[PDB]
Scaffold this active site. Structure first.
Site, PDB file in Angstrom:
ATOM      1  N   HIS A  24       0.782  -1.133   0.095  1.00  0.00           N
ATOM      2  CA  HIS A  24       0.053   0.047   0.093  1.00  0.00           C
ATOM      3  C   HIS A  24       0.924   1.332  -0.017  1.00  0.00           C
ATOM      4  CE1 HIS A  24      -2.030  -3.236   2.582  1.00  0.00           C
ATOM      5  NE2 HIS A  24      -2.781  -2.960   1.455  1.00  0.00           N
ATOM      6  N   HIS A  61       6.093   7.045   5.783  1.00  0.00           N
ATOM      7  CA  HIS A  61       5.573   6.444   4.401  1.00  0.00           C
ATOM      8  C   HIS A  61       5.090   7.556   3.561  1.00  0.00           C
ATOM      9  CE1 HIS A  61       2.134   6.051   7.017  1.00  0.00           C
ATOM     10  NE2 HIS A  61       1.174   6.747   6.195  1.00  0.00           N
ATOM     11  N   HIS A  68       2.000   8.921   0.211  1.00  0.00           N
ATOM     12  CA  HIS A  68       0.813   8.790  -0.218  1.00  0.00           C
ATOM     13  C   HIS A  68       0.797   9.627  -1.630  1.00  0.00           C
ATOM     14  CE1 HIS A  68      -1.337   6.735   3.040  1.00  0.00           C
ATOM     15  NE2 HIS A  68      -0.653   7.294   3.749  1.00  0.00           N
ATOM     16  N   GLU A  95      -3.453  13.355   0.785  1.00  0.00           N
ATOM     17  CA  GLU A  95      -4.439  12.648   1.491  1.00  0.00           C
ATOM     18  C   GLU A  95      -5.272  13.943   1.914  1.00  0.00           C
ATOM     19  OE1 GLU A  95      -3.599   9.497   3.985  1.00  0.00           O
ATOM     20  OE2 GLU A  95      -4.568   8.406   2.248  1.00  0.00           O
ATOM     21  N   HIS A 111       4.095  11.075   5.612  1.00  0.00           N
ATOM     22  CA  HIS A 111       3.582  10.810   7.000  1.00  0.00           C
ATOM     23  C   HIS A 111       4.381  10.190   8.022  1.00  0.00           C
ATOM     24  CE1 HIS A 111      -0.987  10.495   5.418  1.00  0.00           C
ATOM     25  NE2 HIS A 111      -0.565  11.674   5.479  1.00  0.00           N
ATOM     26  N   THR A 151      -5.294   6.644   7.921  1.00  0.00           N
ATOM     27  CA  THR A 151      -6.142   6.765   6.568  1.00  0.00           C
ATOM     28  C   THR A 151      -6.137   5.524   5.898  1.00  0.00           C
ATOM     29  OG1 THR A 151      -4.255   7.443   5.235  1.00  0.00           O
ATOM     30  CG2 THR A 151      -5.222   9.104   6.666  1.00  0.00           C
TER      31      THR A 151
HETATM   32  C1  LIG Z   1       1.198   0.328  11.118  1.00  0.00           C
HETATM   33  C2  LIG Z   1       0.844   1.916  10.967  1.00  0.00           C
HETATM   34  O1  LIG Z   1       1.397   2.811  11.144  1.00  0.00           O
HETATM   35  N1  LIG Z   1      -0.391   1.912  10.640  1.00  0.00           N
HETATM   36  C3  LIG Z   1      -1.077   3.017   9.810  1.00  0.00           C
HETATM   37  N2  LIG Z   1      -2.091   2.911   9.301  1.00  0.00           N
HETATM   38  N3  LIG Z   1      -2.502   4.246   8.783  1.00  0.00           N
HETATM   39  C4  LIG Z   1      -1.573   5.129   8.857  1.00  0.00           C
HETATM   40  S1  LIG Z   1      -1.569   6.649   8.290  1.00  0.00           S
HETATM   41  N4  LIG Z   1      -1.704   6.685   6.776  1.00  0.00           N
HETATM   42  O2  LIG Z   1      -2.949   7.187   8.684  1.00  0.00           O
HETATM   43  O3  LIG Z   1      -0.553   7.298   8.799  1.00  0.00           O
HETATM   44  S2  LIG Z   1      -0.247   4.571   9.805  1.00  0.00           S
HETATM   45 ZN   LIG Z   2      -0.513   7.558   5.652  1.00  0.00          ZN
END
Ligand SMILES: CC(=O)Nc1nnc(S(N)(=O)=O)s1
Ligand SMILES: [Zn+2]
Length: 258
Positions: free
Chosen positions: A61, A91, A93, A103, A116, A196
């Protein structure tokens, strides 16, 4: 199983996770006209140790840079937070095209991508897993990326993309200067929200920086060459992985700046 494709995308998430229609879902559209400055907000205190980073991988993802959170070397404090939040992962997006990938959106405008930085309340909870289930358990710092000149600070990440093209792939990733990736100004907006991505838990105190950082169109395109599928399995590119803005539902978006 959920994803970002037409049949398993965001509109279908409520089918697997009823919370998808919760009262504190993320992301959202930040309407600066409706944002209220709050003098009770404290300046963000960010302490990141470059030796904290351990590995980078393709979750299917997005790419995930995981940090060692057994130690309190990389922590986020201040802002709208009470206590210390340990750095857990980073990570990104993006969308199928440069004109719509972030986002969170601002005044009807989508940036090209959004970084993020995920943290968890290590002061109150034993682990990220348990913190993720508490209203004050997580804190995610969001950084917008807008098309511009190439950003040399992304090279370390982009150089690994081929080695983690397939879902499940991972490679060592250490000595990462995360701090230098942030914009010069840390002015931000904050509101209570959620993850998210499934399980979409409403345990996130969101901190979205106003000032975006740069990324070239060429650089961003590399992330779209990642697959949301595993090696030896039918292929599908991760061309987009951002969730549409969710209903504010009366939540208050606060600004740390005038
Ligand atoms: C393992 C972990 O960190 N899970 C997450 N799930 N959503 C996230 S977010 N996009 O809201 O930052 S991080
Ligand atoms: Zn995120």
């Amino acid at each position: 199983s959920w994803g970002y494709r037409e049949h398993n995308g965001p509109i279908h998430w409520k089918e697997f996770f009823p919370i998808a229609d919760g009262d504190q879902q993320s992301p959202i559209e930040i309407k600066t006209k409706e944002v209220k400055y709050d003098s009770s907000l404290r300046p963000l205190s960010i302490k990141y140790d470059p030796s904290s980073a351990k590995i980078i991988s393709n979750s299917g993802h997005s790419f995930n840079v995981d940090f060692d959170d057994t130690e309190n070397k990389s922590v986020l404090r201040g802002g709208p937070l009470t206590g210390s939040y340990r750095l857990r992962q980073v990570h990104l997006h993006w969308g199928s095209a440069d004109d719509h990938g972030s986002e969170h959106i601002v005044d009807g405008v989508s940036y090209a991508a959004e970084l993020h930085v995920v943290h968890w309340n290590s002061d109150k909870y034993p682990s990220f897993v348990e913190a993720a289930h508490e209203p004050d358990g997580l804190a995610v710092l969001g950084v917008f990326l807008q098309i511009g000149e190439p950003n040399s600070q992304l090279q370390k990440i982009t150089d690994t993309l081929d080695s983690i093209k397939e879902k499940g792939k991972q490679t060592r990733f250490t000595n990462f200067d995360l701090l230098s990736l942030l914009p010069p100004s840390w002015d931000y907006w904050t509101y209570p929200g959620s993850l998210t991505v499934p399980p979409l838990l409403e345990s996130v105190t969101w901190i979205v920086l106003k000032q975006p950082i740069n990324i070239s169109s060429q650089q961003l395109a590399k992330f779209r060459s990642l697959l949301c599928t595993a090696e030896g399995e039918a292929a599908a590119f991760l061309v987009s992985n951002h969730r549409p803005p969710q209903p504010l539902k009366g939540r208050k978006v606060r600004a740390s700046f005038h």
